[PDB]
Amino acid sequence: MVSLAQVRGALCGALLGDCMGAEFEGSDAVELPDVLEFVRLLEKEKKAGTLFYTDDTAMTRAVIQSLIAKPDFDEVDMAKRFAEEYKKEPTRGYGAGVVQVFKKLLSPKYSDVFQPAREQFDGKGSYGNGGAMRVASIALAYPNIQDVIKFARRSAQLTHASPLGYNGAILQALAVHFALQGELKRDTFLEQLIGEMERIEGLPFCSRLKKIKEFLASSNVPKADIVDELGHGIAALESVPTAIYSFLHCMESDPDIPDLYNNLQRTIIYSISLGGDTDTIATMAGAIAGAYYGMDQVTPSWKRSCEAIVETEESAVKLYELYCKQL
């Protein structure tokens, strides 16, 4: 049985990764030293709430409010909350494409809430990581893996109609789902994910999960190799496996990151140090780590720095009660 500490951990880990990663997003200059300096400064900051969240968290909050309002899952309700959140705070950092989905949903013209997403990119759909950046809460609300898969897919398909986009969301939901199942050994965790994605894809995501297995079996893998083989990009394929790798890697000491940081801290630091799409890779890695290690590794000095931490903690309690009702 999942603990309150795990649901809280996942949501706070997602918030921290977004808030902390946001400062570096789209840098091909961010290096580990920058991130370590940022963290030391952040811990000494006298004012609370100095880091604002981005679209990653804005959409997360909308997903959560939809699940609480309509716990059997209502994609029409969720689409409306996404569109209305966009309209209310359009500057949070959304992808250039997905804005058009929100505009179409806000218009009177579409009865099918999935149709705007299908029309994206000449009808091929978005392959971006926006479906995955917000999907953790599906795994926190629905214990049954079949529900996690079908609702991750549908939640993603409101904006991301490409199989790369919505399979990336499924993968991220499954990573959170398997992280909730306890002391899970690295090898078991990957076997669980590969098992599910082979069925779902069959294989681009499986191929990357296989590379992850190879990397974890090596030592001192340079950042360059991770970036080159897994990616650090806005495409789901180039970010969701990378977030999973970050989590798995950070289950053990990293030679470049001081051991005074706990595993969840290490995970967020490491994620951000890979550069590229840093808010999204760290929000995804942070969700997984939070689910795994729980709220005991979300420290007071870190969490107080984030916009909407109190609202986030309150929403975790509500999600936990939905999870418990689903049992």
Ligand X SMILES: O=c1[nH]cnc2c1ncn2[C@@H]1O[C@H](COP(=O)(O)OP(=O)(O)OC[C@H]2O[C@H](O)[C@H](O)[C@@H]2O)[C@@H](O)[C@H]1O
Instruction: Tell me the C-alpha to C-alpha distance, in Å, between residue 302 and each of 150, 177, 205, 264, 265.
Output: 34, 24, 32, 11, 9
- Under the binding rule (CB under 6 A), the answer on residue 277 touching ligand X is yes
Tokens describing residue 93:
């950092």
The window from 38-46, 87-95, 195-203, 286-294 that contacts ligand X (CB under 6 A) reads 87-95
- Under the binding rule (CB under 6 A), the answer on residue 168 touching ligand X is no
- Under the binding rule (CB under 6 A), the answer on residue 60 touching ligand X is no
Q: Cα dihedral angle (155, 158, 160, 165), rounded to 10 degrees?
A: 10
- Under the binding rule (CB under 5 A), the answer on residue 238 touching Mg ion is no
Residue 116 touches which of ligand X, Mg ion, none (Cβ within 5-8 Å per kind): none
- Under the binding rule (CB under 6 A), the answer on residue 285 touching ligand X is no
- Under the binding rule (CB under 6 A), the answer on residue 93 touching ligand X is yes
> Which residue matches tokens 């296989």?
210
- Under the binding rule (CB under 6 A), the answer on residue 86 touching ligand X is no
Burial zone of 272 (CB within 10 Å; 0-12 exposed, 13-18 middle, 19+ buried):
buried
Q: Which of 57, 60, 66, 129 binds ligand X (CB under 6 A)?
A: 129
Burial zone of 177 (CB within 10 Å; 0-12 exposed, 13-18 middle, 19+ buried):
buried
Instruction: Tell me the C-alpha to C-alpha distance, in Å, between residue 210 and each of 216, 280, 286.
Output: 10, 22, 22
Is-contact 321 51, C-beta < 8 A? Answer: no
- Is 56 assigned to a binding site? yes
DSSP 152-212: HHHHHHTT--SHHHHHHHHHHHHHHHHHTTSS--HHHHHHHHHHHHHHHH--HHHHHHHHH
- Smallest distance, Å, CB 315 to Mg ion? 19
Q: Which of 13, 128, 163, 231 binds ligand X (CB under 6 A)?
A: 128
Question: How many other CB atoms are there within 10 angstroms of residue 262's CB atom?
Answer: 16
Q: Which of 29, 96, 224, 327 binds ligand X (CB under 6 A)?
A: 96
- Is 200 assigned to a binding site? no
- Is 55 assigned to a binding site? yes
- Is 234 assigned to a binding site? yes
- Is 129 assigned to a binding site? yes
- Under the binding rule (CB under 6 A), the answer on residue 127 touching ligand X is yes
- Smallest distance, Å, CB 177 to Mg ion? 22
The window from 211-219, 267-275, 277-285, 296-304 that contacts ligand X (CB under 6 A) reads 277-285
Q: Which of 71, 74, 75, 95 binds ligand X (CB under 6 A)?
A: 95
Is-contact 169 153, C-beta < 8 A? Answer: yes
Tokens describing residue 258:
């001081």
Residues in contact with Mg ion, shown as a per-residue x/- string from 87 to 126 under the rule CB under 5 A:
------x---------------------------------
Instruction: Tell me the C-alpha to C-alpha distance, in Å, between residue 221 and each of 1, 59, 258, 289.
Output: 35, 33, 18, 20
Binding site for Mg(2+): what residues are annotated?
18, 25, 54-56, 277, 279-280
Please give the residue ranges that form the binding site for Mg ion (CB under 5 A). Answer: 54-56, 93, 277, 279-280
Binding site: what residues are annotated?
18, 25, 54-56, 124-130, 160, 234, 277, 279-280
Binding site for substrate: what residues are annotated?
55, 124-130, 160, 234
